[PDB]
């Protein structure tokens, strides 16, 4: 594992808010989606980072950026309470605007089939919309506080700032531990396993792992002494995932209980998000200090 610190400001020293790697690409050249406080979404090519496209459609700051599994539809979540669906040095054209949030959107989740979108906002409600119709189809407003995490598996998992974890059947099914709003991070994106058997919940400090059989009691909890975990990302049998603390980045495996690798003391601010690529060989890691850094590793356990 090699760590390279990028000395260039991605958006003229703006704070770091969200990342998204093109899952549709199956080659070595990776595409990075970068939308932050600059009220613009910048597309960069990573292989060395080269800026490709810049989209200023968002009227306000963008907090969550994500793409569909096919990699052709990019959903950008901003503070204008609107989610813009982007379609195909590069040209980007917005296809749909997935409105329906009363407050700023914090977390965005996609569907494997790509026909549904799951959104999380500060309006304490969950927005589920059909991509085919472009309109909201289901709403889960059981959150009593700010909603900062949602994912799609049969079930949909929703996490809010009220220290309660909600799982809803695609009505709420199970309710599950966390801390108060003292965390300085703006993302608590929970991560489900690639097969969906396991669910990872950060900001508990420890991170709990729940199984498909019973999500009410987590068998194991990975501690995060000092800094608290903010985002969880899994590389796309054995599986490798990553959990980002406030200022530390750790990578865990499906077999080893202890972390496989630990990275810290890289950025001077709180971390923003954690995300891997389609091939898993490119993973640039940074915090909200306004800069970027890159972590690269080989030995892909194909």
């Amino acid at each position: 594992m090699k760590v390279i610190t990028c000395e260039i400001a991605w958006h003229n020293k703006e704070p770091v808010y969200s990342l998204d790697f093109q899952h549709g690409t199956a080659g070595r050249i990776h595409r990075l989606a970068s939308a932050g406080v600059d009220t613009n979404v910048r597309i960069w090519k990573v292989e060395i980072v080269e800026f490709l496209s810049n989209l200023a459609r968002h009227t306000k700051a963008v907090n969550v950026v994500r793409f569909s599994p096919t990699g052709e539809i990019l959903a950008s979540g901003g503070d204008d309470a609107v989610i813009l669906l982007w379609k195909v040095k590069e040209n980007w054209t917005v296809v749909k605007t997935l409105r329906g949030h009363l407050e700023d959107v914090y977390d965005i989740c996609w569907a494997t089939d790509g026909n549904l979108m799951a959104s999380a906002s500060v309006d304490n409600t969950a927005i589920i919309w059909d991509v085919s119709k472009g309109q909201k189809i289901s709403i889960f407003n059981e959150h009593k506080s700010y909603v900062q995490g949602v994912t799609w598996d049969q079930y949909v998992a929703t996490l809010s700032c009220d220290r309660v974890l909600r799982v809803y059947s695609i009505r709420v099914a199970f309710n599950v531990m966390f801390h108060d709003d003292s965390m300085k991070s703006f993302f608590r994106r929970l991560s489900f396993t690639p097969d969906g058997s396991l669910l990872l919940t950060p900001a508990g400090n420890t991170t709990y792992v729940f199984s498909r059989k019973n999500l009410k009691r987590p068998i194991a909890h990975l501690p995060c002494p000092g800094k608290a975990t903010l985002a969880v990302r899994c590389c796309p049998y054995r599986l490798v995932f990553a959990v980002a603390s406030e200022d530390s980045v750790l990578l865990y495996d499906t077999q080893q209980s202890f972390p496989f690798g630990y990275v810290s003391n890289i950025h001077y601010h709180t971390l923003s998000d954690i995300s891997w690529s389609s091939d898993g060989a490119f993973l640039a890691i940074s915090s909200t200090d306004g800069y970027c850094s890159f972590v690269t590793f080989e030995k892909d356990e194909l």
């Binding site: 594992m1 090699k2 760590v3 610190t5 420890t206 068998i219 194991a220 909890h221 990975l222 501690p223 002494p225 750790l250 209980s257 202890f258 972390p259 496989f260 690798g261 630990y262 990275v263 810290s264 003391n265 890289i266 972590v295 590793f297 030995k299």
Partner: peptide
């Protein structure tokens, strides 16, 4: 930068 290769006990798992 601090990096540990793909081999931490202080960060163990407590069941």
């Amino acid at each position: 930068p601090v990096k540990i290769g793909c081999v931490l006990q202080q960060f163990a798992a407590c069941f």
